[PDB]
């Protein structure tokens, strides 16, 4: 079901003392084979390339000759004039290429089955050609770098102590650096002291508790669905260009939200308070970012028709829109009024609609049963029922029926700053996930 | 058209959310009876507006009626394109300075029509011989007027800010 | 150019036609073509109109001449420039203070 | 409404580049919707607004005998609309190739070659094609006013306006219900052959509206042009390539009425790089045309393919003026008999992206026996922009002038053949 | 400006900022950003600069706050590829006399 | 590169003159050779177009 589970799996070492970078790696590989990964021995370059036309036969289910494979390798796979940035774009955006056969039919060569992640075949390899390294290579392409260190290599100098042809290793995206007592991980950004332990992440338990060891780290994050959802569903390739990785508790609460959708939709229930729920991420969230990811996953999640992430306004609507055209492609604003907003409810392909609560109230005081009424629609509020109580909520329970009523909030019921609105417990149901 | 959601700074987090929409003219005591009070005077929390322009989060209501009277002062085709016209300018009294200085073209719809108007019917050169009738580069004439003149392409026509 | 393209319907088109001696300025970007608005005339598309406020002194065929008393700065049309300050402000030698009589 | 849907095309689908590039995509989606509606209408002769995959080859051969495009079981635009906004692009690339398999008989195919595409990324291509298919899908098209949209869309700003084409047709037509019509050399569009069917909806088609044309995209749009007007499969086809190099059919046949619109002074290098001195169409000329024109190759080609009731209505820039002794003996061989009969000049402009006055040559193997010119300079109704249009019954005035050899003042008339040989063969 | 070019090194000395269309006047603001007193800098602009109203007057006034601009030179239409307008050459150094220059 | 007709192979004008186009050692100044490296449309219509 989930990715981050509430129960915590056991922690063990694989030692084979970690001062040597050649022994416990083998036990790690054998644990991955116990997780169902496949160690092959290609300590070379060209045959590894042929491994790609090994995998894609399995992947897209179609057959190359040699010449079209040279065309695909030259023109799309291993364009030599390109760096890590556009190749990262090919990871997260341009992961499909059209191709014309000698039969002259156009077929869409994929790279990752982002629909059925279980279809995607994985492999694991290790050191060759320097240092002693571990490489997780999925569907032919190498993705995850793993380097163990000594006990002497401190967590601050995990990066601060250590740091064509071949150009095939340019596809490497994640720098998962370990030492024996800790493991951190980050994107394709290698600044010296700013991207140290502060900007990298330890893995954590279900709610808050961080992880230090290795084999438990393996049994958590190196799972099949887990590592793929890391690589696909929770990777934010900002068009800075900068890849961003979400916090683990962010991903966990997102999983709680989407699984709540999955559970309530198959139970064909709507409009209950306990069908809702809310998140106390008042700080350390990137509530913009986490809301964007949850919203886009709702849009692709296809149970529904519309996702209304609504807020109240004090330079918020222009702000987060500006935050989300950073997250480049698609978001319909609530500009400028409830005139063409109905055209926006008519419109799709730009599915996420963001507006003020007061524009919505200008639609909900009147306007007499909009055609998106009895449709499956998810209302992602912000500043939950401790900061919304009135005409929105009462005409929400009055008018609207098939709403999935969620919301991030920095405002649950506090003793400190609860001068916003009414209760949340019998209105939005129960609290779901929180962070200090 | 031109209505604001303004209340209240009491319970600053948009608690005591009252007062739906206020078309102009807008009074202190009218909104005050709409909202009561927040035991003191901290109100007109500007958070939402149907306005054809850009307004600020703490603009006083007398200034709001001032802006509305400047809107109602202007002709309605200019009231429709205040958003486009204010791009060149910065305020409305500024716009009220050169409100005489706007050339309106419902007749002209692109730059080509502007060139054909200012050449043919204006008669900026006189003779149009039949040997020369086709042979007036309206495209380059529009490029040169675009270099010189301040032009704005709108829905209802083309507006020339001539000084 | 010349002061005559032919007739039009004067009924219900707001054509001014009635002071029997105004003047004009043609052109925008030329500022040299001068005509006395003689009899009953339209407002056709570039006729930036000039008459007087004080109609006791001016006798504006006077000032119709007084434009072309200076052709050396007034009546030279060269580029794409409007000259509102140039014909608006100053100066003109006037036999004021024999005004108006 | 006609101009309302024309306005819908003039706004909605026009996005987001120059129209000559997305034109192919728009017209392809339009044509696919047409085949969808036509095939769905035909299979009802019982509620296929949604189909069923029950394809019977002994029954599906009957469209291949009859319409020669079995679309699919369930791969039409009405059935695309459910799967519209979904992965992926090349289902239309498949559903081009499959109905264009259809080898039985007389393929008239290799045809939907538009979408390749650009495009910059695959999701961008998918969203753009979804937008185009929705915008074509989001139209109000009833069932017969479908080609009018194609008439407007081909009449973008950038082509032989309809009254001029109508004038060519009425020049091509009087006292005539006689198989065959028509042949066209250098057809360009079929927009001038559109009025041929408006004439031939009256009695009947006679044979195929035979054209040959050079530019391959123009070739494809012309073939779908005369496909869209409910024109039957069997006869109506166009050959690709130059007519000056390789005309076909040479054997088939001496024709009875022919029209044209040749290009403007397009060159050709064949004099005499092959033995075109000793061909069948340039040999009675005695000389060949220079490289700075092509028009007389068309007209000798024309009078080659011509019957007793054969007439040739061709257009010209005034490069047929006198232009020297070789062009004299061209003109002389024309006035050797009553080959050329009347000429008609028009007034500038009347044409897109063009200036000059044009000329209309009328040719027949039929006695007169003199040249009776039928020429005005005005009118030539030059009020609507620009010399537009030769209005309805303004053209009938000109046809009435054409009718029986009239001699109207401030208008042209007969000349003597002795006068025009006493003249130096002028117009 | 929507970014911190509202409060950059060159448009905060400008006071009012470059509009959506006439941002040619930003470039001389850029040109003084890359400038020393001895070495002189020659730019050109199409002649839509008289001082272009109060939207650019202070800009012009900033340029005559000191002699940031030194000299101007006019030209003849065409003397280009089909303009047919002149331009205005603006030569900028902080090498002052000081006197206004109209040596055109 | 410029001699004949009917050779092998096709592709000489977009991609794979890589050792002058990339040329990382040193002072490389990329997008340096964005004109003609290796591809390529036909057999020696293409490469005899190059030849002639």
One DSSP character per residue, D37-57 reads: HHHHHHHT---TTS--S---H
Q: Give B83→chain E minimum CA distance, Å.
A: 13
Q: Give A335→chain B minimum CA distance, Å.
A: 10
Does residue A282 sit in the same domain as residue A335? Answer: yes
Q: Are the C-beta atoms of residues B64 and B24 closer than 8 Å to each other?
A: yes
Does residue A377 sit in the same domain as residue A406? Answer: yes
Count: domains in chain C: 1
Direct distance between the N- and C-terminal alpha carbons of chain B, in angstroms, rounded to an integer = 31
- CA angle, F22 then F27 then F32, to 5°: 45
Nearest CA to A406 out of A417, A396, A416 is that of A396
Cβ-based contacts under 8 A for chains B and E: 18
Are B123 and C1 in contact (CB < 8 Å)?
yes
Are F15 and A164 in contact (CB < 8 Å)?
no
Structure's resolution in angstroms: 4.5
Q: How far apart are CA B95 and CA B84, in angstroms?
A: 12
Q: Are the C-beta atoms of residues D299 and D310 closer than 8 Å to each other?
A: no
- Domain with residue C78: its CATH number is 3.90.220.20
User: What range does the domain containing C2 cover?
Assistant: 1-101
The beta strands (E) that lie in A148-270 are given as 174-178, 183-186, 235-238, 242-245
Which secondary structure element, helix H or strand E, spans residue D402, and what is its range?
helix D394-403
Task: Tell me the three state secondary structure of residue E63.
Answer: helix
Q: How far apart are CA E71 and CA E41, in angstroms?
A: 10
3.30.1360.120, 3.10.20.480, 3.40.50.720, 3.10.310.30: CATH of B1-59: 3.10.20.480
DSSP string of C27-86?
A: -TTT--B--B--SS----SS-EEE--S-TTT--THHHHHHHHT-TTTSS---SS---HHH
Residue of A nearest to D93 (CA): A106
- Domain final residue pick, A210, A244, A278: A244
Nearest CA to B163 out of C51, E54, D235, D351 is that of E54
Nearest CA to A257 out of A413, A392, A381, A388 is that of A381
- Domain with residue A94: its CATH number is 3.90.640.50
Sort out which chain B residues have CB atoms less than 8 A from A336's CB and list them.
Answer: 50
| A79 has a chain F CB within 8 A of its CB | yes
DSSP string of A311-367?
A: E--SS-HHHHHHHHHSS-S--EE--SSSSSHHHHHH--SS-EEEEEHHHHHHHHSSS
- Domain with residue A330: its CATH number is 3.40.50.300
- CA angle, B3 then B7 then B8, to 5°: 160
Strand partners, A97: A109
Is F touching E (3+ C-beta pairs, cut-off 8 A)?
no
CB burial readout D346-356, b (16+ within 10 A) else e: bbbbbbeeeee
Are B48 and A387 in contact (CB < 8 Å)?
no
Are D122 and A105 in contact (CB < 8 Å)?
no
CB burial readout B27-62, b (16+ within 10 A) else e: eeeebeeebeebeeeebbbbbbbbbebeeeeebebe
Residue owning tokens 């008393």: C69
Q: Which of E19, E48, E82 is opposite residue B148, by nearest beta carbon?
A: E48
Sort out which chain E residues have CB atoms less than 8 A from B90's CB and list them.
Answer: 55
Residue owning tokens 């059919």: D249
Q: Cα torsion at B91, B92, B93, B96 (round to 10°)?
A: 130
Sort out which chain E residues have CB atoms less than 8 A from C79's CB and list them.
Answer: 47, 77, 85
> Taking the domains of chain B in order of start, what are their residue ranges?
1-59, 60-101, 102-162
Q: Which of D94, D127, D130 is opposite residue A105, by nearest beta carbon?
A: D94
Chain mean position to CA D25: 21
- CA distances to B60, B65, B97 from B20, rounded to whole Å, are 17, 17, 34
Chain breaks in chain A (C to N over 2.5 A) after: 129, 163
Q: Which of B122, B126, B149 is opposite residue C45, by nearest beta carbon?
A: B122
2.60.40.1120, 2.160.10.10, 2.40.50.100, 1.10.8.560: CATH of B60-101: 1.10.8.560
Sort out which chain B residues have CB atoms less than 8 A from E19's CB and list them.
Answer: 87-88
Q: Are the C-beta atoms of residues D380 and D330 closer than 8 Å to each other?
A: no
Q: Cα torsion at C41, C43, C48, C51 (round to 10°)?
A: 40
Handedness of CA E70, E76, E78, E79 (dihedral sign): negative
Q: How far apart are CA D3 and CA B121, in angstroms?
A: 28
Are D122 and A97 in contact (CB < 8 Å)?
yes
Interface of B with E in 59-88 (CB under 8 A): 87-88
Are B145 and C80 in contact (CB < 8 Å)?
yes
Is F touching D (3+ C-beta pairs, cut-off 8 A)?
no
Give all domains of chain D, ordered by start, each with its CATH number.
2-154 (1.20.1260.30), 162-422 (3.40.50.150)
Category of D348 on φ-ψ map: left (φ > 0), alpha (ψ -120 to 50) or beta: beta
Is F touching A (3+ C-beta pairs, cut-off 8 A)?
yes
Does residue A283 sit in the same domain as residue A413? Answer: yes
Nearest CA to A28 out of A153, A157, A126 is that of A126
Nearest CA to A355 out of A299, A303, A316, A402 is that of A316
Q: D407-416 long-range CB contacts below 8 Å, 24 or more apart? A: D411/D374, D411/D375, D411/D376, D412/D372, D412/D373, D412/D374, D412/D375, D412/D376, D413/D372, D413/D373, D414/D370, D414/D371, D414/D372, D414/D373, D415/D370, D415/D371, D415/D372, D415/D373, D416/D370
Does residue A313 sit in the same domain as residue A392? Answer: yes
Q: Which of F15, F22, F24 is opposite residue A74, by nearest beta carbon?
A: F15
Residue of E nearest to B98 (CA): E53
Q: Are the C-beta atoms of residues D163 and D389 closer than 8 Å to each other?
A: yes
Q: Give A405→chain D minimum CA distance, Å.
A: 27
Close Cβ partners of D299 (under 8 Å, ≥ 6 residues apart): D312, D314, D361, D363
Chain breaks in chain F (C to N over 2.5 A) after: none
- The yes/no answer on whether domain B102-162 falls in CATH 1.10.10.1190 is yes
User: What range does the domain containing A303 cover?
Assistant: 245-435
Q: Cα torsion at A315, A318, A324, A326 (round to 10°)?
A: -100
Q: How far apart are CA D118 and CA D132, in angstroms?
A: 14
Count: domains in chain A: 3
Peptide bond preceding D16 in cis form (omega within 30 of 0)? yes
Close Cβ partners of D427 (under 8 Å, ≥ 6 residues apart): D320, D321, D343, D345, D359, D373
Check residue A72 and report its DSSP letter: H
Q: Give C28→chain E minimum CA distance, Å.
A: 16
Q: Which of A312, A362, A417 is opposite residue B14, by nearest beta carbon?
A: A312
- Domain final residue pick, A244, A263, A283: A244
Q: Are the C-beta atoms of residues A328 and A239 closer than 8 Å to each other?
A: yes
Check residue A263 and report its DSSP letter: H
* Token pair of A85 as six digits: 């940035």
Does residue A219 sit in the same domain as residue A353? Answer: no
Phi and psi at A376, nearest 5°, equal -70, 115
Task: Tell me the three state secondary structure of residue D341.
Answer: strand
Are B13 and A417 in contact (CB < 8 Å)?
yes
Chain A partners (3+ C-beta pairs within 8 A): B, D, F
Ligand-binding site membership of A135 (annotated) = no
DSSP string of D103-124?
A: -SS----S---------SSHHH
Most distant CA pair in chain F, distance: 39
Q: Are the C-beta atoms of residues A230 and A144 closer than 8 Å to each other?
A: no
Count of Cβ atoms closer than 10 Å to residue E81 Cβ: 6
Strand partners, E44: E89
Does residue A261 sit in the same domain as residue A311? Answer: yes
Strand partners, B102: B161
Check residue D221 and report its DSSP letter: H
Ligand-binding site membership of A335 (annotated) = no
Residue of B nearest to E82 (CA): B140
Residue owning tokens 């020369």: B132
Strand partners, A431: A278
């Amino acid at each position: 079901n989930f990715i981050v589970l509430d129960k915590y799996i056991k922690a063990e070492p694989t030692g084979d003392s970690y001062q040597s970078e050649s022994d416990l790696e083998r036990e790690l590989i054998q644990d991955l084979r116990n997780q169902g990964y496949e160690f092959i021995s290609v300590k070379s370059q060209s045959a590894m390339l042929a491994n790609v036309r090994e995998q894609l036969q399995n992947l897209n289910g179609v057959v190359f000759n040699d010449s079209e494979w040279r065309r695909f390798t030259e023109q799309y796979l291993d364009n030599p004039s390109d760096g890590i940035l556009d190749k990262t774009r090919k990871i997260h955006i341009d992961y499909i290429c059209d191709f014309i056969f000698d039969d002259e039919r156009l077929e869409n060569i994929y790279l990752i089955d982002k629909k059925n992640l279980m279809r995607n075949k994985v492999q694991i390899i290790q050191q060759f050609e320097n240092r002693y390294d571990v490489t997780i290579l999925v569907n032919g392409l190498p993705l995850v770098q793993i380097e163990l260190k000594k006990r002497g290599v401190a967590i601050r100098e995990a990066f601060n102590q250590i740091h064509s042809e071949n150009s095939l290793f340019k596809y490497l995206q994640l720098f998962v650096i370990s030492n024996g007592t800790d493991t951190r991980y980050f994107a394709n950004t290698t600044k010296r002291d700013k991207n140290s332990f502060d900007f990298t992440m330890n893995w954590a338990k279900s709610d808050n508790t961080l992880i230090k060891d290795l084999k438990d780290f393996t049994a958590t994050c190196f799972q099949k669905h887990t590592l793929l959802n890391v690589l696909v569903n929770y990777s934010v390739f900002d068009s800075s260009q900068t890849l961003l990785v979400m916090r683990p508790y962010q991903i966990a609460a997102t999983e709680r939200i989407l699984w709540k959708i999955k559970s309530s939709f198959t139970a064909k229930n709507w409009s209950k308070p306990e069908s809702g729920g809310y998140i106390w991420h008042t700080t350390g969230s990137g509530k913009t970012l986490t809301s964007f990811k949850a919203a886009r996953l709702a849009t692709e999640l296809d149970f529904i028709d519309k996702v209304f992430f609504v807020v109240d306004r004090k330079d918020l609507d222009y702000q987060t829109m500006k935050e989300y055209q950073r997250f480049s492609p698609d978001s319909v604003n609530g500009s400028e009024n409830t005139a063409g907003l109905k055209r926006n409810l008519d419109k799709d392909d730009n599915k996420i609609i963001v507006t003020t609560i007061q524009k919505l109230n200008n639609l909900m005081k009147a306007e007499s049963d909009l055609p998106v009424y009895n449709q499956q629609v998810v209302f992602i509020f912000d500043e939950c029922h401790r900061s919304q109580f009135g005409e929105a909520q009462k005409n929400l329970k009055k008018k609207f029926k098939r709403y999935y009523q969620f919301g991030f909030t920095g405002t649950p019921i506090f003793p400190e700053n609860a001068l916003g609105s009414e209760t949340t417990a019998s209105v939005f149901g129960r609290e779901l996930h929180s962070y200090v | 058209d031109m209505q604001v959601y303004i209340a209240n700074l009491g319970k600053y987090n948009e608690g005591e959310l009252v007062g739906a929409w206020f078309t102009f003219p807008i009074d202190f005591e009218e909104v005050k009876e709409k909202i009561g009070l927040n035991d003191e005077y901290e109100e007109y929390a500007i958070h939402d507006y149907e306005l054809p322009f850009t307004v600020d989060e703490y603009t006083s209501i007398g200034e709001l009626n001032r802006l509305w009277e400047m809107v109602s002062e202007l002709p309605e085709e200019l009231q429709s394109e205040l958003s486009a016209l204010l791009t060149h300018f910065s305020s409305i009294e500024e716009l009220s300075e050169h409100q005489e200085d706007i050339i309106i073209h419902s007749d002209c719809d692109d730059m080509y029509d502007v060139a054909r108007y200012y050449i043919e019917e204006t008669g900026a050169l006189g003779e149009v011989p039949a040997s020369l009738q086709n042979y007036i580069d309206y495209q380059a004439y529009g490029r040169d007027l675009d270099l010189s003149g301040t032009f704005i392409s709108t829905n209802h026509g083309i507006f020339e800010i001539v000084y | 150019g010349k002061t005559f393209i032919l007739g039009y319907t004067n009924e219900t088109h707001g054509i001014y036609q009635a002071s029997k001696a105004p003047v004009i300025i043609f052109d925008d970007f030329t500022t040299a073509n001068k005509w006395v608005d003689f009899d009953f005339k339209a407002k056709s598309s570039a006729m930036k109109m000039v008459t007087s406020c004080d109609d006791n002194k001016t006798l504006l065929k006077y000032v119709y001449y007084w434009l072309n008393t200076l052709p050396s700065e007034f009546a030279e049309g060269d580029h794409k420039r409007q000259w509102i300050s140039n014909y608006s402000q100053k100066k003109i030698p006037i036999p004021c203070p024999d005004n108006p009589e | 409404e006609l101009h309302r849907q024309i306005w819908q095309i003039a706004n909605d689908v026009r996005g987001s580049v120059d129209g000559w590039d997305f034109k192919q995509y728009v017209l392809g989606a339009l044509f696919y919707r047409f085949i969808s509606e036509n095939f769905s209408s035909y299979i009802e002769a019982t509620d296929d607004i949604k189909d069923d995959a029950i394809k019977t080859k002994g029954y599906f051969i009957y469209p291949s005998q009859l319409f020669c495009n079995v679309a699919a079981k369930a791969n039409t635009n009405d059935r695309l609309n459910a799967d519209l906004n979904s992965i992926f692009v090349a289902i239309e690339s498949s559903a081009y190739g499959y109905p264009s398999e259809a080898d039985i008989k007389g393929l008239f195919a290799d045809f939907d070659t538009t979408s390749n595409r650009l495009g910059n990324t695959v999701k961008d291509k998918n969203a753009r094609l979804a937008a185009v298919l929705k915008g074509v899908e989001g139209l109000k098209l009833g069932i017969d006013l479908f080609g009018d949209a194609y008439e407007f869309l081909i009449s973008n700003y950038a082509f032989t306006p309809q009254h001029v084409s109508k004038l060519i047709a009425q020049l091509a037509m009087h006292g005539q219900t006689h198989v065959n019509k028509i042949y066209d050399p250098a057809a360009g569009s079929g927009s001038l052959l559109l009025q041929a069917k408006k004439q031939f909806d009256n009695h009947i088609i006679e044979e195929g509206f035979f054209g040959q044309e050079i530019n391959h995209t123009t070739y494809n749009l012309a073939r779908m042009n005369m496909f869209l007007h409910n024109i039957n499969y069997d006869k109506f086809d166009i050959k690709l390539g130059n007519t000056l190099t390789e005309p076909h059919f040479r054997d088939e046949k001496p024709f009875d009425a022919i029209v044209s619109n040749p290009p403007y002074s397009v060159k050709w290098i064949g004099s005499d790089d092959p033995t075109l001195i000793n061909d069948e169409r340039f040999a009675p000329a005695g000389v060949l045309a220079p490289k700075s024109k092509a028009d007389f190759a068309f007209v000798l080609h024309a009078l080659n393919y011509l019957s007793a009731k054969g007439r040739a209505a061709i257009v010209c820039f005034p490069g047929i003026f006198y232009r020297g002794g070789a062009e004299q003996k061209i003109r002389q061989y024309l006035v050797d008999n009553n080959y050329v009969e009347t000429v008609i000049s028009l007034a500038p402009n009347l044409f897109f992206g063009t200036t000059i006055a044009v000329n209309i040559l009328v040719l027949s193997k039929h006695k007169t026996d003199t040249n009776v010119q039928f020429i005005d300079a005005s009118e030539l109704f030059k009020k609507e922009t620009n010399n537009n249009i030769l209005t309805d019954a303004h053209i009938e005035q000109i046809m009435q002038v054409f009718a029986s050899k009239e001699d109207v003042a401030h208008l042209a008339k007969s000349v003597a053949f002795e006068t025009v040989v006493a003249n130096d063969y002028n117009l």
